[PDB]
């Protein structure tokens, strides 16, 4: 009863709790209406902590007497402890309806909703409380907490200050207000409030963590590190401190220790998706790609909100060539938010690799406007523009590019430009060599992972059976012009004193040239399945050796391993590679005199006559003679067809210009050309046009096969005026500069009937070219753009014009030899760098002293003369046609002999322990 | 989905901001393409000052509707909320293109300019908005604000009037209205519109602050205090409310309270030179010499800056003589205050009055009128009350001009009868009427820079010659004032540089008090030491003759009474604090009881008829020590002066100093500083307030009076010289730094004037040490206080009238005012 319940109270006060609870139960059984009995009931339940016992006891109490107000408050406390929120809210509603004012119960409901997740109602009820409870420490504290959750810090400062009025010093409230200040950006206010918290009590380690976060906001490395360490000493239970300490340590450069911190933090809890990102990033930095991808996928699967995970996984897929997956990741990242410009920059790189230049240009513009200093994005945008040759804001862009070049050169960062792109920006020779050296030692940084001991370079040929073991190493043995330039030399390489080793490093294509050169080699090697440069280097060292350079996908770090005693760059890159392991480089005096060695990082091997090589004497010998270049015809049986003709017009020159009268054969040919027919047969000779030779024989069109049929070609097939002196040049838009185009405009204005022949390289840039020509005052008739044709037909249609063109920006090597074998002459102006001196040296080997201009004006004047002086033009054309065969320019066998002589010089130099001059 | 949006819109209409944002966040989750919902959510977020969320909602809304006018307008409103210039201006351009017919867009754009500086385009957009409509009276408001910035004052007045006439719903408009009313000088309507605005919105505290400023112009001190209270309770952080509250407390003499509130302002703003200088003045009053040099030098910098910044000088010219600044600085501040007069007189639009150059209009005489509010209970009237009666009616006509209501004091009505004419100007609210009356009086030739002096009247120039004499011991800086009276020594040519008026040199001095009239009973006294016990009375000689024997100690002598039954009975009465007794039929009293026995005679209105005795021991004054004395106002004392006094004390074996509590709040710090300067508490004596007669009388017991080098004791010097008492003084820098030496020269005792502070201490100790020297000096000063005409107020009037003769001979000959030499 009442007295027995109070005796139970005495029992609890004296310490005998169980007797207390038994007497409470007894008194309740006597009269359940006991308010004191219910109080002792609740006290016993709380001491026991029985959730269901307390729940049912309070249900019985409330149904017995619902007036109990604070009892409903403790009921809500219990329901919150359970976690079931609807019961708590219903109880709060019942209490408020029964008695309107419960600011404490309203605070309880506010915390309930804070658990529920609706900030706004929470702050609303907080204000309700602070109104009806002007002094309520919990109300203001939780209000500040909810505002901190909602990022609305300003009201939180006032709420926490009023709580401070209620509690003049409390560490938790100080830390919360410090977080409010940090989210305010109030660095000093935040650090002060955090130090107020720690002086309130140094127990909280997360206090140290947050203080060191403020320190990092101020950038104090060591002090923040000390705070993090001390917090770990107090508690390593939470891994946020470990995570940020790992972050800063990672920034320090002591890598693997911070890596271990990352991994153990993630061990503490997988929820640190950011730590997962850091781990995958360092995995990529070390080359652990697949696991990094797995971690990024994990982070996305747990946290689809973030997108820079997509960015970095796209970076991984770039490292692993997964273009499709990378683009998917970029799409997801941009879909989350496009404000992350560098993601669009990587997507632009992807499109550039894909040829979607305009999208990349637009994305790069968006990035650069987003962040003014994105030197890599700026450089890549410039590269895309030079791809499309849009000279809008041309020279100012070049100037800012030079500025970015110097800026990145100073701060020891990777030059955003590429060595192939170097000629697009005529910077200093020092800039050239610095970029090349940095990119060459990019191989060194990768090769350092295995720390392979240096190979014992053989010194004598006795190990190699008295023969020179030469290893030709390239992944480009296939659909590539360089192969289409030197593939015959392996066969023509002399096996008498030299052994041939050829190393394929890319998936095979099945082309005739591939297996052809494979058979040419004394030893073909298929390295295209060795992911480790070390294994390939070991294989080479086994081969005891005594082509790609800065090319897409190339992995020349094996050269940095120097498995051969002599390593020299040649035909791989148009210039020096900045490679300390490239002992020599093969060039000529005409293009590389000893005086320009200031920009050269390798020793110079001098070719007595020429360095470049091509074998259209074998690649396309059928075009050695043809049947002045308006409508031209060629075929395997040219002389046989001519002798099968009724009448042939003979033009004297041991040479002649074969001329056919406009007879029935000629008229039928013209009709077939005009009707776009497949081909016809005349006199038993297959007469074909070039517009569908692939449908006739694509392999023959590739030059793998010499076209056995007979091809007649007319400029009218392109709709050209068949009575005009036509200029031509077909290289990609990169070789084009505004100044040379204006000089060409001057040439075309000087020459009465002057038009220019162009190839769509690429296509979509035509409007810019037309606008530039109009601003240079030349009509559309002066320029014609055409789709691309295979190499054989490329050279075939090249000789249609009387003269080609030269851009001293980048010299002519591919098309230079194409036209050297086309018999159509061309003039050029030498440059400073090798890439601007290729065609020049080609013509020096040709020996035409008058095909070099020492100034742009000289170039223009000679161009006008030759396009106008048709008698001098004909003499030059005949001299070119004679000398392209008479000269050893295509004597690839004797070229091979002289290369062997140069190899003899190299091995005499090395074997004696020691630049090669002839 | 949309239904929850509608319910949230309803709840926002009910005014639940947070329920509104909750429901609208729910709606935007329900419909990501709910443009109008994003609009409403951003709007309510802005209502609740929630910037970033409104930013996001509005960015989405623009993605859903690329162009809506009010959308972009409120976007720019939030842009103002966080304050970004380019965002604001570009949003304004997009708004004006979106809807040209929307004035408030132009208004906020003008606000952007206002924070930027393109005030031109600001007013331009104002005009454009007016062209669209004058309904948006907000435009009227802020355009009148920028006009007030410019100075098209009356035009701005028109703007504010018409804007309020559009609608009174904009309290700030009423506020600026009352502000300009105060600026021009009309008060009652300003207060009424203050109350109008406060009725509309009682929230604005500085509204109450300016109400209080207007009331202080009305001089309703209680109104000032109540407005201060309401303002500071609405906001204590408003440093200006505290500053002006402390100013009013300084007016009420609450110097510590003013110091506290002024330090409150200084913490609310580190450098508020106005409250800074007023706090400094309060410190000077209390002489809290802590933070001495930093405060005073920052004041020097402040006054130089405001000389450059052409602002209101914070240091009042009364305090000019206090701060050690330049002659140019002080006369420049004086000229600034002269402008503060002339600008106000400009609205009176009165062309200059006629200025006679003859005597016939004044029936062969010269009309000189005297204007002041100090007619009555004021030291000036206590200095020169009888001289108006001593003016010659044969050559001059006397005119009085009361600037204060009559107090009924004897001096007041006495001088009113002395003057040939009295005028009660204190009844005239308009300066124009007073100047017209003066011109009616035909005046050709007294407070100066002081409290309540309507100096604008002198600015009005109703008299051809306007001069200031002994009214305020500093220059005016106002060229409309012509002359100032001085002597050969105090204000020589080398100091003439700091006067905007012409100088007037008296024969030997220009100072005079009514001691010879108000206190002649001390002409001779009654009491081996010299001034241990003092007794005087009208029947003093009769009592002495009624005595058994009276000793005579030297035509001049010192009456002495032996220690007989009567003398010892007087001693006992003193030790008992008896009100009064009567011996031999002669009533015997003390000054301490003269408050009730005869307050009128104690005030100098009457000569004390009774015989009154007093001695040192009445207040703990040792009877065998060298007692130096000085009793001026506390602010006239500085640490350097106290240290000079410390040197003088340490150069005398047993010397004590008598002082006053003026008031007493600062005395503890004073004595603490004295202890810091090695001065024992026994060596200093303090006394409470004493009325004129007794405070003058008590000096005779003391030995030597003192003069502060910075400022002389104007009243005090006359008080001590009428007692035949030596005093130490030195020629200083300011005019008020040479008055005491001027009186010493007038007495001719030049050896009592020291040339330096070292010589100051030398002469002080020399006097306080040698018995023959001190006694003979005291006696000779006693002799010469009557032998010299120093108190001949009639001869003072004679020389004043001779100077009048010379001045009128110069002026009536067409000459502009010129320095009077001899």
Residue numbers in the entry:
A (entry chain A): 79 to 624, 629 to 709, 721 to 746, 761 to 1021, 1025 to 1028
B (entry chain B): 181 to 625, 629 to 710, 719 to 745, 761 to 1028
Paper text:
Since the current full-length model of OGT is a composite of two independently-solved structures, in this work we determine the structure by cryo-EM of full-length unliganded OGT to assess how the catalytic section is oriented with respect to the full 13.5 unit TPR region. Through iterative cycles of particle classification in Relion we were able to resolve substantial heterogeneity in the particles and determine a 5.3 Å cryo-EM map. Into this map we could readily dock two copies of the X-ray structures of the catalytic region and most of the TPR 11.5 section. We find that OGT, in agreement with the 11.5 TPR-only crystal structure, forms a dimer supported by a relatively small interface (~560 Å2), which buries <1% of the total surface area of the full-length protein. Early maps generated during data processing provided density into which only the catalytic domain appended to TPR units 6-13.5 could be modelled, TPR units N-terminal of the dimer interface (TPRs 1–5) exhibited high heterogeneity, suggestive of flexibility in the TPR units of this region. Interestingly, we captured only one dominant conformation for this TPR region into which we could further model TPRs 3-5 for one chain of the dimer. Notably, by cryo-EM we do not observe this 40° kink but find that, in the absence of crystal contacts, OGT does deviate from the previously observed 2-fold symmetry with each chain being related to one another by a 173° rotation. We note from our cryo-EM structure that TPR 10 is shifted 5 Å further away from the catalytic domain compared to the OGT/UDP X-ray structure (E334 Cα to H529 Cα comparison). The positioning of TPR 10 in the cryo-EM model widens the gap between the TPR region and the catalytic region compared to the previously proposed full-length model and leads to a propagation of increasing discrepancy in the positions of the TPR units as they extend away from the catalytic domain toward TPR 1 and the N-terminus. In the unliganded structure, the immediate advantage of having a larger gap between TPR units and the catalytic domain would be for protein substrates to have increased access to both the TPR groove and catalytic cleft.
